[PDB]
Amino acid sequence: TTFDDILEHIGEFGRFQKQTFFLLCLLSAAFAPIYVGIVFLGFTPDHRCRSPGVAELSQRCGWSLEEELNYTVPGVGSSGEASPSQCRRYEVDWNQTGLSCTDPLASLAANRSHLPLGPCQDGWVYDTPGSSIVTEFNLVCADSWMLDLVQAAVNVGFFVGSMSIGYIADRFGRKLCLLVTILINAISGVLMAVAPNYTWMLIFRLIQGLVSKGGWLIGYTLPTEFVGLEYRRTVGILYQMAFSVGLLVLAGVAYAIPHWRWLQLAVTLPNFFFLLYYWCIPESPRWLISQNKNAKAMKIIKHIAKKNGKKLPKSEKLNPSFLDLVRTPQIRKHTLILMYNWFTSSVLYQGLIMHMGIAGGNIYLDFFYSALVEFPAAFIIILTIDRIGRRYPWAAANMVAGAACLITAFLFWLKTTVACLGRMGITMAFEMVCFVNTELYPTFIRNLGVLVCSSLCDIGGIITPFLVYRLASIWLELPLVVFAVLGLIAGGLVLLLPETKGKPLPETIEDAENPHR
């Protein structure tokens, strides 16, 4: 007796699976913000040093924002293309000593260089009507690193969170861990909007990061276990699609309400809504059967059977271990290759979206187009995964990503199209990685196998904001060349991974030892 055969009689894809997947995929939307929400929660608008005298001078004569932009602000191009205008104040005696409206500073200095420069004090003025983290905490001139540090904190939380949560989930089931992660993520997200000081907000963001990705992956693994062999691709890829749709909705919601506090408070409301009603999904019977807890598994199977609409026919110790993950040489090889794939995926993904994307345009529209590019990738992957196997299309997608990045490295009209194509390729590679990794490991360590293998992803996220800079100074286009090298090498290494087309996912370590047999 095997789980697959029992599943066949109940029905690989039926009413129960439809309901479960429809409820589950919404969690993907709730995780869409945590990953890439810095783009909207914290954005840097055009800003200038506060000028108390300018306030008085504005009512003296007719003033316009564009007009006042130049004759009452330090000129750009001195000791930096934009350094003076950004966060340097002339500190002239504008108030009580106004020479004239046309040339208030012409008589004081008469020369851009002659005009004195000093530290940016009295605060800052931001053009955007909608506040944000940057405006809230004045992280503009001497604290630019702070905004990147927030994202680095999220990327650091993901790491430890995965490393612990994977072990906890694989030792005490998926359902309980998923519920706890959902609750902690919701509470941290909602409390973030009430952080009075920057430090507390950063700590709350770290706490939320510790749980977000772990919960997301634990939610991804479950539907694959529920579904049968034939329909695995559909659920596995439609999950990714929800993330895409979720990403798309978030763009619109961000345009709807700009105030970052309100944005965060609202965006996590679905996270709270899930907690109440997601306690109607059962624990995966595969884990119970593998863990020698068939008693509960039979009740779960009966519950599934009654809802499905078919009649069920009448008819030693396994524990997780980190060292076991590498005990088997073949498992060692698989894990190493997959970890390298994670690392080479995260760097490309984050770096290209933050930099590769076409410059200019609104904050929202460009992100919208970035989200839109992914939908074709899901379609192409769905078309060919079963027909020509998972291995070759994934390798080809990684190769295409690397090639597109390299050709972009060396009026940018072609650059936009190449960027979109590359942007497509990288998502294809990421999805393929996420799909294959679950199906490769044995069941009783799968949750521990993937999450730990995903920990290396975090390191890439930390490296990208730093590495690029060090490379960018060394040579203008060096980061793209390195990206291409990483992409192509990863695509080549992918070919070595054993193929899985019709093989049922293994439930023992020996089975994973020799996948060919």
Ligand X SMILES: C[n+]1ccc(-c2ccccc2)cc1
- Of 243 and 441, the one with the shorter C-beta distance to ligand X is 243
- CA geometry: angle 38, 41, 44, nearest 5 deg: 85
Smallest separation, CB 341 to ligand X (Å)? 13
- Give residue 500's region: left, alpha or beta (phi > 0; psi -120 to 50): beta
- Of 92 and 371, the one with the shorter C-beta distance to ligand X is 371
Smallest separation, CB 136 to ligand X (Å)? 27
Smallest separation, CB 121 to ligand X (Å)? 41
- Of 53 and 351, the one with the shorter C-beta distance to ligand X is 351
- Of 272 and 375, the one with the shorter C-beta distance to ligand X is 375
Smallest separation, CB 325 to ligand X (Å)? 20
Backbone CA torsion sign across 86, 90, 91, 95: negative
- Angstrom CA distances, 193 to 187, 209, 465, 491, stand at 11, 15, 26, 41
- Angstrom CA distances, 8 to 82, 224, 289, 341, 370, stand at 66, 15, 16, 34, 40
Smallest separation, CB 23 to ligand X (Å)? 19
- Of 353 and 471, the one with the shorter C-beta distance to ligand X is 353
- Of 45 and 270, the one with the shorter C-beta distance to ligand X is 270
Residues in Cβ contact with 176 at an 8 Å cutoff, skipping those fewer than 6 apart:
none
How does DSSP assign 99-163, residue by residue? --SS-TTTTTTSSTTTS--B---S-EEE--SS--HHHHHT-SSTTHHHHHHHHHHHHHHHHHHHH
Backbone φ and ψ for 48, nearest 5 degrees, come out as -150, 155
By Cβ distance, which residue is nearest to ligand X? 243
What is the C-alpha to C-alpha distance for residues 450 and 275, in angstroms, rounded to an integer? Answer: 24
Smallest separation, CB 369 to ligand X (Å)? 15
- CA geometry: angle 512, 516, 517, nearest 5 deg: 85
Dihedral angle, C-alpha 178, 180, 184, 189, nearest 10 °: 30
- Of 240 and 284, the one with the shorter C-beta distance to ligand X is 240
Which amino acid is located at 200 in the chain? W
- Of 3 and 158, the one with the shorter C-beta distance to ligand X is 158
Q: Which residues bind ligand X (CB under 6 A)?
A: 35, 213, 216, 240, 243-244, 374, 427, 430-431
What is the C-alpha to C-alpha distance for residues 412 and 477, in angstroms, rounded to an integer? Answer: 14
Smallest separation, CB 44 to ligand X (Å)? 24
- Of 243 and 367, the one with the shorter C-beta distance to ligand X is 243
- Angstrom CA distances, 435 to 162, 308, 392, stand at 18, 26, 14
Beta-carbon neighbour count of residue 221 at 10 Å? 25
Smallest separation, CB 368 to ligand X (Å)? 15
Smallest separation, CB 419 to ligand X (Å)? 16
Tokens 């007719």, residue located: 62
Query: Could you tell me if 508 and 442 are in contact, meaning their C-beta atoms sit under 8 angstroms apart?
Result: yes
- Of 244 and 408, the one with the shorter C-beta distance to ligand X is 244
Smallest separation, CB 488 to ligand X (Å)? 20
Query: Could you tell me if 217 and 450 are in contact, meaning their C-beta atoms sit under 8 angstroms apart?
Result: yes
- Of 35 and 226, the one with the shorter C-beta distance to ligand X is 35
Query: Could you tell me if 75 and 85 are in contact, meaning their C-beta atoms sit under 8 angstroms apart?
Result: yes
What is the C-alpha to C-alpha distance for residues 128 and 298, in angstroms, rounded to an integer? Answer: 59
Smallest separation, CB 36 to ligand X (Å)? 9
- Of 240 and 268, the one with the shorter C-beta distance to ligand X is 240
- CA geometry: angle 100, 101, 105, nearest 5 deg: 65
Smallest separation, CB 423 to ligand X (Å)? 10
Smallest separation, CB 366 to ligand X (Å)? 17
What is the C-alpha to C-alpha distance for residues 398 and 436, in angstroms, rounded to an integer? Answer: 14
- Of 154 and 254, the one with the shorter C-beta distance to ligand X is 154
What is the C-alpha to C-alpha distance for residues 12 and 4, in angstroms, rounded to an integer? Answer: 9
